[PDB]
């Protein structure tokens, strides 16, 4: 019976991590969108 | 029956017969064909008059070229489909 | 193969006019997804023996051991839930895939982990690919710093603090600002 | 519209279905204690259906191509093309025949446009 | 000289038959997407579209029945180059035909 709890819980953690990486990478792409030209390479490595 | 060609007007009795005139039509045209920039094109309007002059002098007095026939002329377009950076890295990354 | 792919012989449905109840397992019997030592098919063999002794489905099915394709959630007139299973007893069940009427298709239900792994792999692949045909163009220098070689740069074109003791707009920015003030200057 | 005899058929076979509609009122409504009024509805059908038939006859009255001679009505179309096919390029030739003058005449309008501009600024 | 011999096992009577017979199957906008695999698209597949050009001609034109095929024909005539032979245009493309079906 525990498995449903495993679903809601562990997938809550998973969807949380997804909510992190996705929208944070929107913030990332936006940082790229700051570009009049050159990208901040070290910053990009920080992103990675 | 050339009126069957005029039945395009009968098609205009069956349709609006396209938007025809439009400033936007002049905008895609601002993109389309030689040259570009309507002001610069206006500077080119005399040169455009030159385009209507001897630039169009080419005519028809040569071999029919059977090798060109027929749908293979499109196959040449397929040959175009085959035989024919800053930001861009970041672009494709996006 | 078992995912979003065509497998259709519509004319059967054209004859049937669509599904009813047990006839879903008919077109499903046409499907590869149908199992031969399923209780649906070994008791199809019973139909080739007893014939009459099958009832609807689940009565003859679940009481007898083996692979089965039980019905639980109809979704008229398109989907119909039909899970694969393996009875180990007249009472016990060991359910498998939920085969489902994808309409002129029926599929095994994918693992979440499969698509999740697809996402992880493709994403980290985008990371690595970002590291591929992009990296090592800004060559490092202690002095010059990262460098960006070109046939022509244009387009466009931890150190020191103390030193010797455009504005591409010709102050055009403030001029435009003044235009904002001035367009309604008579008006305001 | 056309083939309006088929539209009459819409008042035939479909009216024939209307007889089927008339049929379904006597299944068991009698001794299970109106149908008497339903007989007046039968009178209403005696009106409706028959008048529809009269309408059918009225559209029969004016079948297009009363001459009913396609063998010769197509010949009528032949004469009509004897007119039209002649008129085709002739009527459109007038277009170019006009513009050959009138385009340059419009630029003449532009030249008196020059002089109008001269009048603009004394 | 022996292009027919290039076939692994074909040659075939071919003729007019399966041509138009599949041209009506070309008609479906829903069919568009599947062509985004490997069966045919912008590769050597393009030749199919470049030789199926004959329909506008007399005789072949009569046997056309579902001008939705003529509208997919419009798609090839249009820059299918673009998303029309790529991303365009989901189920709505069928609606784009359904509207043509509606009118």
Cβ pair E47:B81 closer than 8 A: no
List the determination method.
cryo-EM
Q: Where are the domains of chain A?
A: 1-48
Cβ contact C87:C94 at 8 Å: yes
Q: Which helix (H) or strand (E) holds C71?
A: strand C66-75
As a whole number of angstroms, the distance between CA C37 and CA C45 comes to 10
Question: What are the tokens at B86?
Answer: 């800053």
Residues of A in contact with B86 (CB under 8 A): 37-38
Spell out which chain E residues touch chain B, with contact meaning CB-CB distance below 8 angstroms: 42, 46-47, 50-51, 53-54
Cβ pair C156:A37 closer than 8 A: yes
The whole domain housing E71 covers 5-103
As a whole number of angstroms, the distance between CA D99 and CA C126 comes to 63
CA E93 to chain CA centroid, Å, is 15
Give the 3-state secondary structure of residue C114.
helix
Length of chain D equals 122
As a whole number of angstroms, the distance between CA D2 and CA C95 comes to 63
- The count of structural domains within chain E is 1
Give the 3-state secondary structure of residue C5.
coil
Q: Which residue of A has its CA nearest to C139?
A: A41
User: Do A and B count as touching (3 or more CB pairs closer than 8 A)?
Assistant: yes
CATH topology for the A1-48 domain: Methane Monooxygenase Hydroxylase; Chain G, domain 1 (1.20.58)
CATH for E39: 1.10.10.1340
Residue E73 burial class via C-beta count within 10 angstroms: exposed 0-12, middle 13-18, buried 19 and up: buried
Measure E29 CA to nearest chain B CA, in Å.
Answer: 23
Cβ pair C155:B89 closer than 8 A: no
Long-range own/partner contacts, residues E50-56 (CB < 8 A, 24 or more apart) = E50/B71, E50/B72, E50/B74, E50/B75, E50/B77, E50/B78, E51/B71, E51/B74, E52/E19, E52/E23, E53/B71, E53/B74, E54/B71, E55/E23
Question: What are the tokens at D82?
Answer: 């004897």
Phi-psi region of B51 (alpha: psi -120 to 50; beta: other; left: phi over 0): alpha
**Omega before C77 cis (within 30°)?**
yes
As a whole number of angstroms, the distance between CA D40 and CA C158 comes to 105
Phi and psi (nearest 5°) for C106? -140, 135
Cβ contact C105:C7 at 8 Å: yes
Residue D98: count other Cβ atoms within 10 Å of its Cβ.
11
Name the neighbours of D, counting chains with at least 3 Cβ pairs within 8 A.
B
């Amino acid at each position: 019976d525990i498995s449903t709890e495993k679903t809601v819980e562990s997938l809550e953690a998973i969807r949380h991590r997804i909510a992190q990486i996705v929208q944070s990478l929107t913030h990332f792409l936006a940082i790229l969108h700051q570009s009049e030209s050159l990208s901040p390479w070290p910053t990009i490595h920080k992103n990675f | 029956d050339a009126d069957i060609s005029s039945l395009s007007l009968s098609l205009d009795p069956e349709i609006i017969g396209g938007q025809n005139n439009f400033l936007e039509n002049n905008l895609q045209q601002i993109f389309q064909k030689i040259i570009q920039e309507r002001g610069p094109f206006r500077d080119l309007k005399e040169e455009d008059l030159q385009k209507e002059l001897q630039k169009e002098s080419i005519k028809d007095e040569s071999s029919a070229k059977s090798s060109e026939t027929e749908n293979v002329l499109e196959f040449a377009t397929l040959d175009s489909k085959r035989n024919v950076d800053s930001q861009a890295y970041k672009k494709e990354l996006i | 193969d078992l995912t979003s792919i065509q497998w259709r012989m519509p004319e059967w449905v054209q004859s049937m006019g669509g599904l009813r109840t047990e006839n879903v397992l008919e077109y499903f019997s046409q499907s590869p997804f149908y199992s031969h030592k399923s209780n649906n098919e070994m008791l199809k063999m019973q139909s080739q023996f007893n014939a009459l002794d099958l009832g609807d489905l689940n009565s003859q099915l679940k009481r007898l051991t083996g692979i089965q394709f039980v019905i639980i959630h109809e979704r008229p007139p398109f989907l119909w839930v039909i899970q694969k299973q393996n009875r180990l007893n007249e009472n016990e069940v060991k359910p498998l895939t939920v085969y489902f009427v994808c309409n002129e298709n029926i599929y095994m239900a994918p693992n979440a982990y499969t698509l999740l792994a697809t996402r992880m792999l493709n994403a980290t692949y985008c990371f690595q690919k970002a590291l591929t045909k992009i990296e090592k163009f800004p060559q490092y220098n202690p002095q010059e710093g990262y460098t960006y070689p070109k046939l022509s740069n244009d387009n466009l074109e931890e150190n020191k603090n103390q030193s010797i003791e455009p504005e591409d707009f010709s102050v055009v920015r403030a001029f435009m600002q003044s235009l904002h003030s001035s367009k309604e200057a008579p008006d305001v | 519209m056309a083939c309006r005899c088929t539209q009459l058929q819409d008042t035939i076979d479909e009216v024939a279905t209307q007889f089927y509609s008339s049929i379904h009122y006597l299944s068991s409504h009698h001794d299970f204690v109106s149908a008497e009024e339903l007989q007046f509805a039968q009178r209403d059908l005696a009106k409706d259906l028959v008048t529809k038939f009269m309408q059918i006859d009225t559209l029969i009255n004016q079948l297009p191509g009363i001459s009913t001679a396609p063998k010769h009505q197509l010949e009528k179309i032949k004469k009509l093309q004897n007119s039209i096919e002649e008129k085709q390029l002739e009527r459109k030739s007038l277009e170019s025949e006009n513009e050959d003058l009138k385009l340059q005449l419009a630029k003449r309008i532009e030249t008196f446009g020059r002089l109008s501009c001269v009048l603009f600024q004394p | 000289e022996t292009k027919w011999l290039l076939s692994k096992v074909p040659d075939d009577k071919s003729r007019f038959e399966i041509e138009l017979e599949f041209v009506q199957m070309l008609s479906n906008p829903w069919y568009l997407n599947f062509l985004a695999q490997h069966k045919y698209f912008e590769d050597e597949a393009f030749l199919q579209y470049l030789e199926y050009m004959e329909y506008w001609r007399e005789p072949e034109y009569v046997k056309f029945i579902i001008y939705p095929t003529c509208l997919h024909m419009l798609t090839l005539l249009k820059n299918p180059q673009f998303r029309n032979d790529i991303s365009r245009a989901d189920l709505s493309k069928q609606v784009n035909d359904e509207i043509y079906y509606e009118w």
